[PDB]
Structures are given as structure tokens and as C-alpha cells.
Coordinates of C-alpha atoms and ligand atoms in Angstrom, one line a residue:
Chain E
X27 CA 11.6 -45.2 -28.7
X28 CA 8.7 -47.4 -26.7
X29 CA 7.9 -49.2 -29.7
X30 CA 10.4 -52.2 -28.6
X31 CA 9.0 -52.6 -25.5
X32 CA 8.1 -55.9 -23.7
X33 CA 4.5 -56.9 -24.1
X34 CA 4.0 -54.8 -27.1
X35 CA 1.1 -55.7 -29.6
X36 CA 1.3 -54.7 -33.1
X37 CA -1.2 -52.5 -34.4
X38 CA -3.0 -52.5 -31.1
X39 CA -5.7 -48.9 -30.6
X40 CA -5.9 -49.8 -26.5
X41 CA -4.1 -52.5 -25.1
X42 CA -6.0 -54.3 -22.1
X43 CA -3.6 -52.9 -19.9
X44 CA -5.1 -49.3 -20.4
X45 CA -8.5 -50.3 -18.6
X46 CA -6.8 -49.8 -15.3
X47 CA -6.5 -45.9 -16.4
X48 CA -8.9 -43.5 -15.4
X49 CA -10.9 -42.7 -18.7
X50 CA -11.2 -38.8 -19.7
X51 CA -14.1 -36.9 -18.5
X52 CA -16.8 -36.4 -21.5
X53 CA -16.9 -33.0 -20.8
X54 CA -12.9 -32.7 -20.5
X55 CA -11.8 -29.1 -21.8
X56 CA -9.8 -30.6 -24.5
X57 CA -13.1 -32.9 -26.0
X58 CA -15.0 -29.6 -25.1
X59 CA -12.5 -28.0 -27.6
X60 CA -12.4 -31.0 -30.1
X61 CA -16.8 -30.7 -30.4
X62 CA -15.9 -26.8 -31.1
X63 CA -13.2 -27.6 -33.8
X64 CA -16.0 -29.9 -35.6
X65 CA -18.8 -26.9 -35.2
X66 CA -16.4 -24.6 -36.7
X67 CA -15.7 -26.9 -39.7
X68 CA -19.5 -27.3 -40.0
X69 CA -19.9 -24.0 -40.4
X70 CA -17.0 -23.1 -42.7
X71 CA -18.1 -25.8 -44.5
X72 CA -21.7 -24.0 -44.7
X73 CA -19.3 -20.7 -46.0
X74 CA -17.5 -22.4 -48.5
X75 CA -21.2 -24.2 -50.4
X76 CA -22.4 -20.6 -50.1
X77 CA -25.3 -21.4 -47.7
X78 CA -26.3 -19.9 -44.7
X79 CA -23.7 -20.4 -41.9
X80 CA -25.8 -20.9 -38.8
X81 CA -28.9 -22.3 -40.4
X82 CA -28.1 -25.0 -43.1
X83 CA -27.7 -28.5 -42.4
X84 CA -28.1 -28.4 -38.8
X85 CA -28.2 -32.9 -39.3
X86 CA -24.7 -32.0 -40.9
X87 CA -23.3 -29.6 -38.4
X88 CA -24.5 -32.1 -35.2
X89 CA -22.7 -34.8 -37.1
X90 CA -19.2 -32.3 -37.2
X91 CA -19.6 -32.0 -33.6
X92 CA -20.7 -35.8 -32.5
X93 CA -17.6 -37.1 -34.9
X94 CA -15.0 -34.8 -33.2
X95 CA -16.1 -35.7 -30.0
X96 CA -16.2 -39.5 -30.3
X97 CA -13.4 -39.8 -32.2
X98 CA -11.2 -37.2 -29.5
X99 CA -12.2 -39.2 -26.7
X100 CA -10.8 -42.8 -28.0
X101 CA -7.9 -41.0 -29.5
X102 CA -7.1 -39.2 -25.5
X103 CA -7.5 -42.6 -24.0
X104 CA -4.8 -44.0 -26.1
X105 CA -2.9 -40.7 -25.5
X106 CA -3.5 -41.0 -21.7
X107 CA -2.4 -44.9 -22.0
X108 CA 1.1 -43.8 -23.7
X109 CA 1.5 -41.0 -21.5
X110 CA 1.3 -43.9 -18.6
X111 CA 3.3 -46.5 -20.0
X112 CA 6.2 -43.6 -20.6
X113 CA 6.3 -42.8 -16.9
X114 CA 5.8 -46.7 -16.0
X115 CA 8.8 -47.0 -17.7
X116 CA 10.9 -44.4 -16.8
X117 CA 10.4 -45.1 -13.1
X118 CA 11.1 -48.6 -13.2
X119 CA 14.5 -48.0 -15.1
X120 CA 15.5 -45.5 -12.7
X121 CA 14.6 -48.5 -9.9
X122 CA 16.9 -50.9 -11.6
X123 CA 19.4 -48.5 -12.0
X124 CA 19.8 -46.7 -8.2
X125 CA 23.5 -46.3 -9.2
X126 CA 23.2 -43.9 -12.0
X127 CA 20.2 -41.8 -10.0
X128 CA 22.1 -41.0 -6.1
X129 CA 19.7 -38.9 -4.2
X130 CA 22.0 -35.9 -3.9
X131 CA 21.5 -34.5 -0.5
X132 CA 21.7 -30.4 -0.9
X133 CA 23.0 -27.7 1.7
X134 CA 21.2 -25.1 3.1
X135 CA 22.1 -21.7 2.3
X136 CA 23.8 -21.2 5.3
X137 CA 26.5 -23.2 3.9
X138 CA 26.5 -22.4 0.6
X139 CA 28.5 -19.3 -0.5
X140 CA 26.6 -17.3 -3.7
X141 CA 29.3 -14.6 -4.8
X142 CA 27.4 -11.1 -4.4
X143 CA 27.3 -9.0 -7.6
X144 CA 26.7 -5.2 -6.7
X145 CA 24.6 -3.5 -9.2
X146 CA 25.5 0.3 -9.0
Chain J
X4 CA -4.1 10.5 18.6
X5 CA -0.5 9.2 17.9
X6 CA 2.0 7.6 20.0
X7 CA 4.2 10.3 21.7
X8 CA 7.4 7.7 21.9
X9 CA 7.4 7.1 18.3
X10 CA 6.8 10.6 17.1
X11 CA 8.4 12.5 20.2
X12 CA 7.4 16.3 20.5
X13 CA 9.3 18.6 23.5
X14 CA 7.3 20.0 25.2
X15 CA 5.6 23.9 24.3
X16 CA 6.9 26.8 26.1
X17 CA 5.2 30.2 25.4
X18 CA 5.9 33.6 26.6
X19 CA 3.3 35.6 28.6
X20 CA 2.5 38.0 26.8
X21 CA 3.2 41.0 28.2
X22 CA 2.4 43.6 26.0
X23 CA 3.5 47.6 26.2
X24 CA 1.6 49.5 24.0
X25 CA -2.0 50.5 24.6
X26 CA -3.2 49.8 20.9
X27 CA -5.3 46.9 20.7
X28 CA -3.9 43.5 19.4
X29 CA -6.1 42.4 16.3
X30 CA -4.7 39.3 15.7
X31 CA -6.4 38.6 19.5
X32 CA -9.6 40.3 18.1
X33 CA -9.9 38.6 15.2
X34 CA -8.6 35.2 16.9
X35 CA -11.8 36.1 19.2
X36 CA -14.2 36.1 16.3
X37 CA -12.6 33.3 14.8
X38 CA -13.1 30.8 17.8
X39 CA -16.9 32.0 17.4
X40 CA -17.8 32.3 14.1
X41 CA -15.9 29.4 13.0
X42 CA -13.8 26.8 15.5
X43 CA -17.8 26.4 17.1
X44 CA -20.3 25.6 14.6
X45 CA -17.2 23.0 13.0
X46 CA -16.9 21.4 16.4
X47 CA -21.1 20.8 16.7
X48 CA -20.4 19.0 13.5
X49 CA -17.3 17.1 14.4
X50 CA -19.3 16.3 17.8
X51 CA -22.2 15.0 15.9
X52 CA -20.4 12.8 13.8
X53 CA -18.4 11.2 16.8
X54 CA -21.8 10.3 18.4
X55 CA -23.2 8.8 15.3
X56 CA -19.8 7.3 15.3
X57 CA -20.4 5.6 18.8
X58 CA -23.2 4.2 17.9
X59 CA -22.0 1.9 15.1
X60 CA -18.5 1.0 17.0
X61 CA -16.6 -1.5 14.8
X62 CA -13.2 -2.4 15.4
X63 CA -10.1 -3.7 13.0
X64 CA -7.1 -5.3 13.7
X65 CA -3.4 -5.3 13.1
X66 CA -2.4 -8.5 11.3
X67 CA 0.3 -10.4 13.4
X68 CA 2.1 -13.0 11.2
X69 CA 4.4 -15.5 12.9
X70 CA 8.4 -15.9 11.3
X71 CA 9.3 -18.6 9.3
X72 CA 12.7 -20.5 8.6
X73 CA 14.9 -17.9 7.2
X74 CA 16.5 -18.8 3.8
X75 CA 19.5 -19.8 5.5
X76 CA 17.6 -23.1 6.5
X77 CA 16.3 -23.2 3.1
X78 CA 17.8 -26.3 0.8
X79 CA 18.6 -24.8 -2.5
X80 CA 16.0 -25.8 -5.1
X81 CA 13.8 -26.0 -2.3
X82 CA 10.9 -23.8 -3.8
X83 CA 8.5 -24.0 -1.1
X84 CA 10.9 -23.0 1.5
X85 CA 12.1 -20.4 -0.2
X86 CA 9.0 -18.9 -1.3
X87 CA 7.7 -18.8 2.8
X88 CA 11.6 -17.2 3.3
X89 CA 11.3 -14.6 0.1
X90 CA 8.1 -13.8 1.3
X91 CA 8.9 -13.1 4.8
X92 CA 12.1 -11.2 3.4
X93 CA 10.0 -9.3 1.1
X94 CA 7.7 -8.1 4.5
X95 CA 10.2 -6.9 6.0
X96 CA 12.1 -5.1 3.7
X97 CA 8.9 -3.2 3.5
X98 CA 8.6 -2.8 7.0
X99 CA 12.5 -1.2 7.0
X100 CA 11.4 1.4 4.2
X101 CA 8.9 2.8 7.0
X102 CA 11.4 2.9 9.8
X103 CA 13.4 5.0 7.3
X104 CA 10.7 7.2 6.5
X105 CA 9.8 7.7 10.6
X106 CA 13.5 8.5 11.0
X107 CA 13.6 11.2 8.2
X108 CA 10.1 12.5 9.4
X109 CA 11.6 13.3 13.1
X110 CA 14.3 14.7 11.0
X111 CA 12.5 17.1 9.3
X112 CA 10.2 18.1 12.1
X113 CA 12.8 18.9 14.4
X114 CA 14.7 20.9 11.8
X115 CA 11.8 22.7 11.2
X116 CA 11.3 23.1 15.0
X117 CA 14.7 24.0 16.3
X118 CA 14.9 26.8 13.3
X119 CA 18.0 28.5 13.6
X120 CA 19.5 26.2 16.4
X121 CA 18.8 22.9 14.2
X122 CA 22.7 22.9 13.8
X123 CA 22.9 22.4 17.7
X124 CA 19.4 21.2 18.6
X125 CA 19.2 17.8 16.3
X126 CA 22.2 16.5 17.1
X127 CA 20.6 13.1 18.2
X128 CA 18.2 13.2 15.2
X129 CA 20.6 13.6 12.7
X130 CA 23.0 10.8 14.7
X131 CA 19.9 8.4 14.4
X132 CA 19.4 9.2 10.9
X133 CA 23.0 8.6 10.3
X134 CA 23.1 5.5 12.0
X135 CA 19.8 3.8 10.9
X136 CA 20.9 4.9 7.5
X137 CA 24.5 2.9 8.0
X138 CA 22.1 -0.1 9.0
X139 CA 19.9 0.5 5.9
X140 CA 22.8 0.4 3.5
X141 CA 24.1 -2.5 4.7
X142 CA 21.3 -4.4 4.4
X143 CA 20.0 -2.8 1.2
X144 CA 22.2 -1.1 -1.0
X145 CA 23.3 -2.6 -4.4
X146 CA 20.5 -5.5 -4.2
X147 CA 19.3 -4.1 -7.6
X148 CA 15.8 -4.3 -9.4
X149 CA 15.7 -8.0 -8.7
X150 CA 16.3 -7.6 -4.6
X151 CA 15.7 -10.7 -2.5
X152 CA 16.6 -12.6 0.6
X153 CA 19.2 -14.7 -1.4
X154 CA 21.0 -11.6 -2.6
X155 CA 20.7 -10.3 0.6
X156 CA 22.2 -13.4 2.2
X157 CA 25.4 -13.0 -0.4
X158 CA 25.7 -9.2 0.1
X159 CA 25.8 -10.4 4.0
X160 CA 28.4 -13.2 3.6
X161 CA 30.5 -10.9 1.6
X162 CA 30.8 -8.2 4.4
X163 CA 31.4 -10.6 7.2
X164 CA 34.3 -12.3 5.0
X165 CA 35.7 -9.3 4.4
X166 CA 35.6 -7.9 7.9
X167 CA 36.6 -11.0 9.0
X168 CA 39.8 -10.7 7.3
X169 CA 40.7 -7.5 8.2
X170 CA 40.2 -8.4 12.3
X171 CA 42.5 -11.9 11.4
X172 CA 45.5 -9.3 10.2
X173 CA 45.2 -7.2 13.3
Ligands
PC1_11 C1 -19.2 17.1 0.7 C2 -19.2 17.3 2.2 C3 -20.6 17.5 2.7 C4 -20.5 18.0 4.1 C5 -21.9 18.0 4.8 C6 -21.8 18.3 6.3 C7 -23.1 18.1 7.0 C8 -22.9 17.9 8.5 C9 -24.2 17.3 9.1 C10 -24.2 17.4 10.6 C11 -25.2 18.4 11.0 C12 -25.2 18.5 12.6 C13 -26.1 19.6 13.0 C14 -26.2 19.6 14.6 O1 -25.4 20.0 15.2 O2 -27.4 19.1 15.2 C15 -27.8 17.8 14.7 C16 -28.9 17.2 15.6 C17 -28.4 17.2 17.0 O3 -28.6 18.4 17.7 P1 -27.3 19.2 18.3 O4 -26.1 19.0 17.5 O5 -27.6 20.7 18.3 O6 -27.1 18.7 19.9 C18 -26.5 19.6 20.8 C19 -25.5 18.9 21.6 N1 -26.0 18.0 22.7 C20 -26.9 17.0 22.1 C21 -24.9 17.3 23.3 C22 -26.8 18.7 23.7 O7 -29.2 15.9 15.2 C23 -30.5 15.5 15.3 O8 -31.3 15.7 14.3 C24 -31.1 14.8 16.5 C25 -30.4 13.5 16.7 C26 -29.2 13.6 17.6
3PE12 C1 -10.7 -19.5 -31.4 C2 -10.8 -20.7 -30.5 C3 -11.0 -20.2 -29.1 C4 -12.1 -21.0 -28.5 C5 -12.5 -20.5 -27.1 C6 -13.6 -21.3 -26.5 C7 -13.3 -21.7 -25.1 C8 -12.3 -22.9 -25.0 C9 -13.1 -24.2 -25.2 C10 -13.1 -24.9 -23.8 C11 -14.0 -24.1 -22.9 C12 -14.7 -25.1 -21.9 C13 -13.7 -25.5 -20.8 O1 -12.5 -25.2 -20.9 O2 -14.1 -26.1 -19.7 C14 -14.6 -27.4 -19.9 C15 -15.8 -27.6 -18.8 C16 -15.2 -28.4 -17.6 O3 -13.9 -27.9 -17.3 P1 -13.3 -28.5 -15.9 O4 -12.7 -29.9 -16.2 O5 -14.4 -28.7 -14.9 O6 -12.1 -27.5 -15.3 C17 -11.5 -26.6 -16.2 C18 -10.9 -25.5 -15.3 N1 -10.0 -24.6 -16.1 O7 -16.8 -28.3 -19.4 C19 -17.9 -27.5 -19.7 O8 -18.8 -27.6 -19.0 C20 -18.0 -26.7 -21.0 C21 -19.3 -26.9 -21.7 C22 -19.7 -25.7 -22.6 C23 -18.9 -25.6 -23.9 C24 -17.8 -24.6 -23.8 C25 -18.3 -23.2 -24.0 C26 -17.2 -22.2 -24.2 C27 -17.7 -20.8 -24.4 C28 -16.7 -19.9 -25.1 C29 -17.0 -19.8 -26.6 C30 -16.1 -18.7 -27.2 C31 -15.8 -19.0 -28.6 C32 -14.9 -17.9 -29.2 C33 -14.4 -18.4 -30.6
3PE13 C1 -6.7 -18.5 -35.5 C2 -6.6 -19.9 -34.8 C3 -7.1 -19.8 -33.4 C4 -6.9 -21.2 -32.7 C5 -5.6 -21.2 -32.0 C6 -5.7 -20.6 -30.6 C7 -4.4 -20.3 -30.0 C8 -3.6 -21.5 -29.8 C9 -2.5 -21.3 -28.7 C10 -2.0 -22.7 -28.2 C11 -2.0 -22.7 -26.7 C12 -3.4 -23.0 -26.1 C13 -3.4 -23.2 -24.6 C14 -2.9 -24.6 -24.3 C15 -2.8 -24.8 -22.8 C16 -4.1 -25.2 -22.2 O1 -5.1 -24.9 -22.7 O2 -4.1 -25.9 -21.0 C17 -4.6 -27.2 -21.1 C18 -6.2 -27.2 -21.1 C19 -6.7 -27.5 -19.7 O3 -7.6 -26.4 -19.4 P1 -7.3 -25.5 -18.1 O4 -8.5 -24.8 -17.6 O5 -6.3 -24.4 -18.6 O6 -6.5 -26.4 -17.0 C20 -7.3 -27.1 -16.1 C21 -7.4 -28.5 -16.6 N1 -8.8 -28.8 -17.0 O7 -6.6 -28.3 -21.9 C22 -7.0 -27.9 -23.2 O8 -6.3 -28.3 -24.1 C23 -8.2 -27.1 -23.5 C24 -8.2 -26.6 -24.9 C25 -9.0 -25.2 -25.0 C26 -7.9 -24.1 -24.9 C27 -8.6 -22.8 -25.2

């Protein structure tokens, strides 16, 4: 739907644009869970060659965790940057547009009549 | 203690006695041996504990909490209003159910004091009870499981639109 946009590059990881973002703590809980997904495929891996889970390969299961982790944290910038651009978007439109988004002014309760439903 | 206005007990009034026979009471005996043997070693306890008591005096306090808008000053949607309102709502639907329960305990302890005059003597208990209880229902009753101030607020509005026409015909 945003792929029309103005200003889009083709093919583009991190437009320029997404350097004004705040980038994604290296310890953020979801690359926290990303370097467990890659220990847990380092070991399953260790299952499945019939070698000792914990112990084999320890240079193989630190490169599991080290690839997860760098490639999550590029990967959540450019899902941080869309995430941006979406709501950059949306609240322009709704700027151009004040005449299909009225602020509706609502009523207190005093005024408003609920019907009452007895339960008995 | 307890507060004598909000638990109210008349006032004890007991014969003489004035007894005729010359056999000896043992109920008076044994109360005799009772107040010795018993009441007075428990009350050298109870007295030691009340000095050790003294000398450790801490104090607590009864939580005052100020009103808030009620939710008919609430916006509709407005979550954080109505969450202040539905809370305050909530603390003093609470606070009813113990007005209730005072109400039915003066009930009971005048029945159970009056005896076999309780159908003259608790005439003004039982009209409290009778008239806190209209109160009660008319706040309460038929709110269901999922009681609130909003509910509340309709069950009000219904009342008053229906007693409203009724005065309007007359
Ligand atoms: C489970 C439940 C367990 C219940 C256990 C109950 C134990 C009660 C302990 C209190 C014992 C008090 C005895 C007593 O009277 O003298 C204490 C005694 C006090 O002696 P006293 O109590 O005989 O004092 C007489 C009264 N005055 C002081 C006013 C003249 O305590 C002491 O050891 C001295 C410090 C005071
Ligand atoms: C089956 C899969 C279930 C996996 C469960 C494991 C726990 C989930 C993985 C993330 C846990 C770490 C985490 O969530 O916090 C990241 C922490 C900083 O978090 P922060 O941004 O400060 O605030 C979060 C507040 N909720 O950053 C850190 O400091 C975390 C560094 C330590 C690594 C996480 C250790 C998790 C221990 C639980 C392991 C249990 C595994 C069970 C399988
Ligand atoms: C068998 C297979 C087992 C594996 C599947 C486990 C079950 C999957 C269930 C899917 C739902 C998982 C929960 C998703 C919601 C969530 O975790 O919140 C986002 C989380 C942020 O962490 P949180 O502490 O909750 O919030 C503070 C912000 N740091 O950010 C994250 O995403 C942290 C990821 C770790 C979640 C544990």
C-alpha cells in the first residue's frame, strides 16, 4: 500500500531518512529473543549430527547467536523505519483532510440516556 | 471499646435480689469461686500484656480519600475518568454493604434482647431496617454480576423518568 509513495527508492534496506529514528537497544527483548532463537538452532543442530548438545562446536553455536543478533537488529531498524513512515503518513493525510476527521465533541453521562436492563 | 451511638445498648436494669428461702444459692457460690480461681489469675495476664503493650505504643490510621467527579461528569470513552468514577463507585458500594450489615446487627441484638416483646420493642429497628433496605434496593438491586456506576446511573434515570411521569399525570 506504501510502496507508491513519494520519495520512494527501489530496493532501498534503510533510506537516509531512517537516521533521524532512534535505533533499537542491543539488548532489546526482541534481539534478546532473536540471539536465543539462533542458540536453540545451534543446539538442535548439535541433536540432529548426533553430537553432544551443550558441548560440540561451541565456534558454531557463538556464530548461531552472533548471526541472529546482527542480522535482527538491521532487520528491526528497517521495521522501526516502516512503522514511522506509516504513522507519518497517516497523520499527515488526516491534516489535509480535517473534513473527513471532525473532532466529535461527546456528552457527559449526565446527558446521555443508557436504557437500564434488569437482570433478575 | 465501641462507639455507643453506632451500636446503641439501653441501659441494664436488674432486680435486687431478694431471695426467700434460706437454702444457699450455689450459682452465688460457685460465681464466688469462679471470680477467684479463674476471672483473677486471667486478668494478671491480660494486665501484663497491656503494660508490655504501653510500652511499644504504635498507632494506625483510617485512610481518608477525597471524592472525585462522579461518572455523570464523565465524557463517554473517557477511560481515565471513568476509571477514578468506577473506582470511587466501587468504594462505596462497599461501604453500603456494611451499613446494611450494622442495620441487620441492631436488628438481631434487639430481637434477641427484647425476647418475647420484640414484636412491640423493635419497632424502630425493624422501621430502619425497612427503610435502609428500600434505599439499598434502589440503588442496588438488579445491577447483576457486572455492577457499576454506569448501570447504576441507568437504573437511576430509569426510576426518576418513570416517577416523573406519574407526578406529571396527577
Ligand atoms: C498459645 C497461647 C500461649 C499463651 C501463653 C500465655 C503466657 C502469659 C505470659 C504472661 C505471664 C504474666 C505473669 C505475671 O503476672 O507476672 C509477670 C511479671 C510481672 O509481675 P506481676 O504480674 O505479678 O506484677 C504485679 C502487678 N503490679 C506490677 C502492678 C504490682 O513480669 C516480670 O517478669 C517482671 C517485669 C514486669
Ligand atoms: C520457549 C521460548 C521461551 C523463551 C523464554 C526466555 C525469556 C524471553 C527472552 C527475553 C528475556 C529477556 C528480556 O525480555 O529482557 C531483555 C532485557 C532488557 O529488557 P528491558 O528493555 O530493560 O525491559 C523489559 C521489561 N519487560 O535485556 C537483558 O538484559 C536480557 C539479557 C539476558 C538474556 C535473557 C535471559 C532469559 C532467561 C530465561 C531463559 C529461559 C529459557 C526457557 C526456554
Ligand atoms: C514451542 C514453541 C515455543 C515458542 C513460542 C512461544 C509462544 C509464542 C506466543 C506468542 C506471543 C509472545 C508474546 C508477544 C508479546 C510480547 O512479548 O511483548 C513484546 C515484547 C516486549 O517485552 P515486554 O517486557 O513484554 O514489554 C516491555 C517492552 N520491552 O517484545 C518481544 O517480542 C520479546 C520476545 C520475547 C517474548 C518471550
Amino acid at each position: 500500500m506504501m510502496n507508491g509513495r513519494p520519495g520512494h527508492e527501489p530496493l532501498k534496506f534503510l533510506p537516509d531518512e531512517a537516521r533521524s529514528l532512534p535505533p533499537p537497544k542491543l539488548n532489546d527483548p526482541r534481539l534478546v529473543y532473536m540471539g536465543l532463537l539462533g542458540y536453540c538452532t545451534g543446539l538442535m543442530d548439535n541433536m540432529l549430527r548426533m553430537r553432544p548438545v551443550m558441548r560440540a562446536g561451541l565456534h558454531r553455536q557463538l556464530l548461531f547467536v552472533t548471526s541472529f543478533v546482527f542480522a535482527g537488529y538491521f532487520y528491526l531498524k528497517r521495521q522501526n523505519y516502516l512503522y514511522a513512515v506509516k504513522d507519518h503518513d497517516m497523520f499527515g493525510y488526516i491534516k489535509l483532510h480535517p473534513e473527513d476527521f471532525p473532532e466529535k465533541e461527546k456528552k457527559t453521562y449526565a446527558e446521555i440516556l443508557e436504557p437500564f436492563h434488569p437482570v433478575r | 471499646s465501641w462507639d455507643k451511638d453506632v451500636y446503641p445498648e439501653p441501659p441494664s436494669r436488674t432486680p435486687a435480689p431478694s431471695p426467700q428461702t434460706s437454702l444457699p444459692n450455689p450459682i452465688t457460690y460457685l460465681t464466688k469461686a469462679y471470680d477467684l480461681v479463674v476471672d483473677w489469675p486471667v486478668t494478671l495476664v491480660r494486665e501484663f500484656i497491656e503494660r508490655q503493650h504501653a510500652k511499644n505504643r504504635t498507632y494506625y490510621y483510617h485512610r481518608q480519600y477525597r471524592r472525585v467527579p462522579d461518572i455523570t461528569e464523565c465524557k463517554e470513552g473517557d477511560v481515565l475518568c471513568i476509571y477514578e468514577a468506577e473506582m470511587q463507585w466501587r468504594r462505596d458500594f462497599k461501604v453500603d454493604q456494611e451499613i446494611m450489615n450494622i442495620i441487620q446487627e441492631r436488628l438481631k441484638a434487639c430481637q434477641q434482647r427484647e425476647g418475647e416483646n420484640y414484636q412491640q420493642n423493635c419497632a424502630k429497628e425493624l422501621e430502619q431496617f425497612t427503610k435502609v433496605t428500600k434505599a439499598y434496593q434502589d440503588r442496588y438491586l438488579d445491577l447483576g454480576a457486572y455492577y457499576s456506576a454506569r448501570k447504576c446511573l441507568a437504573k437511576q434515570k430509569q426510576r426518576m423518568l418513570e416517577e416523573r411521569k406519574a407526578a406529571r399525570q396527577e
